[PDB]
């Protein structure tokens, strides 16, 4: 059995001459050749069983990427695992293979405003999707965006991603210490339980200043820090965001802080588009309920030449609230993804 940095790649015969790609909490994503469609696929290994939280994190990935089909959206091509649950130890994603991501791009390169635009235009369609499914990403960053040579970009590693029907009062159920850090909205550290998709939008936010700079906008070195930094460049809260702010603990911490004073984003990126700078405010936003939301994002004057609300699908079938009971022991979570990957058994 075919292995990579000391990780066995159990891909039986159909998929051979692995190369590793990255890895993540639980496991590793290789490239491979499948033997069967003469082409090359991405194979991301899960070992999640001894731990609850990737039990329900891999059940969510692989449901939700399951119903997903989207041109800036990962798919699954395939799924392996053993041919009963005693042997499962090990699941493998078998996805669309990718030739970089825009952390690695972002390196080796200074993007156009052309580049940056339509790259941007791509990430907000995708979410567009996401979001129109009622699913929050949660990770979003520019390790989870995939390119290819024709400048295509896909959405990546749906493993923080979740269902939040809008129908329920969700407001102290959801988990706490999402996203990366440099990526978090700051009601992630305020609203702990109680945040929304909105903190994708945030996500977006931060790509487009790291897309600006080729350097990240807000790199906290630790939790409390990381608010900090936001408020070095937004400046202190007005009075009625502190209003909106319903944890009274939280909205003391903030009044304890000394006043700082906004930035405005012509000093931190003077040779950037206005439209760019435009967005980037409405995207980084302190108020999660002021945030520009994604179709006003698609439909701002920075992305006209490409926005068309005809060629921008939206989920057929949203996800509602029955689809989001996971919080069950993880025997339990075995034999749910045992159940969801039986499509793709001989
Ligand atoms: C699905 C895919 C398909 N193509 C490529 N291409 C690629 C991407 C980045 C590179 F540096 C080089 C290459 Cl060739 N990458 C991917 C890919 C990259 N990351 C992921 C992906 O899902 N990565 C996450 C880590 O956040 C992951 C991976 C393994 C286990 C876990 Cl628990 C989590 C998939």
């Known amino acids: 059995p075919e292995m990579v940095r000391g ?50 994190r891999t059940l969510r990935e692989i449901k939700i990427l399951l119903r997903f089909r989207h041109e800036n959206i990962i798919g699954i091509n395939d799924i392996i695992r053993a041919p009963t649950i005693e042997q499962m130890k090990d699941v493998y994603i078998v996805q669309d293979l990718m030739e970089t991501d825009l952390y690695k791009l972002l390196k080796t390169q200074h993007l156009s405003n052309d580049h940056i635009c339509y790259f941007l235009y791509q990430i907000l369609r995708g979410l567009k999707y996401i979001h129109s499914a009622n699913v929050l990403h949660r990770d979003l960053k520019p390790s989870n965006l995939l390119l290819n040579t024709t400048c295509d970009l896909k959405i990546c590693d749906f493993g923080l991603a979740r269902v939040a029907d809008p129908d329920h009062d969700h ?94 984003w012509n000093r931190l990126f003077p040779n950037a588009d206005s439209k760019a700078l435009d967005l980037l405010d409405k995207m980084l936003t ?44 993880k025997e339990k979570l075995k034999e749910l993804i045992f159940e969801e990957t039986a499509r793709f058994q001989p």
């Open 7 to 56: 990780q066995v790649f159990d891909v039986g015969p159909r998929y051979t001459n692995l190369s590793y790609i990255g890895e993540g909490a639980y496991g590793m994503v290789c490239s491979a050749y499948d033997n069967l469609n003469k082409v090359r696929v991405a194979i991301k290994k899960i070992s999640p069983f001894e731990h609850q939280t990737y039990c329900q």
């Open 171 to 264: 407001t102290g159920f959801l988990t706490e210490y999402v996203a990366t850090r440099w990526y978090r909205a700051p009601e992630i550290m305020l609203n702990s339980k109680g945040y929304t998709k909105s903190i994708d939008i945030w996500s977006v936010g931060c790509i487009l200043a790291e897309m600006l700079s080729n350097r990240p906008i807000f790199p906290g070195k630790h939790y409390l820090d990381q608010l900090n930094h936001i408020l070095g460049i937004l400046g202190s809260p007005s009075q009625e965001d502190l209003n909106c702010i319903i944890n009274l603990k939280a909205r003391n911490y903030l009044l304890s802080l000394p006043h700082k004073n906004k930035v405005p």
């Open 286 to 329: 302190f108020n999660p309920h002021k945030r520009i939301e994604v179709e006003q994002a698609l439909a701002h004057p920075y992305l006209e030449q490409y926005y068309d609300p005809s060629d921008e699908p939206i989920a057929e079938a949203p996800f509602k609230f029955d689809m989001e009971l996971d919080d069950l022991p």
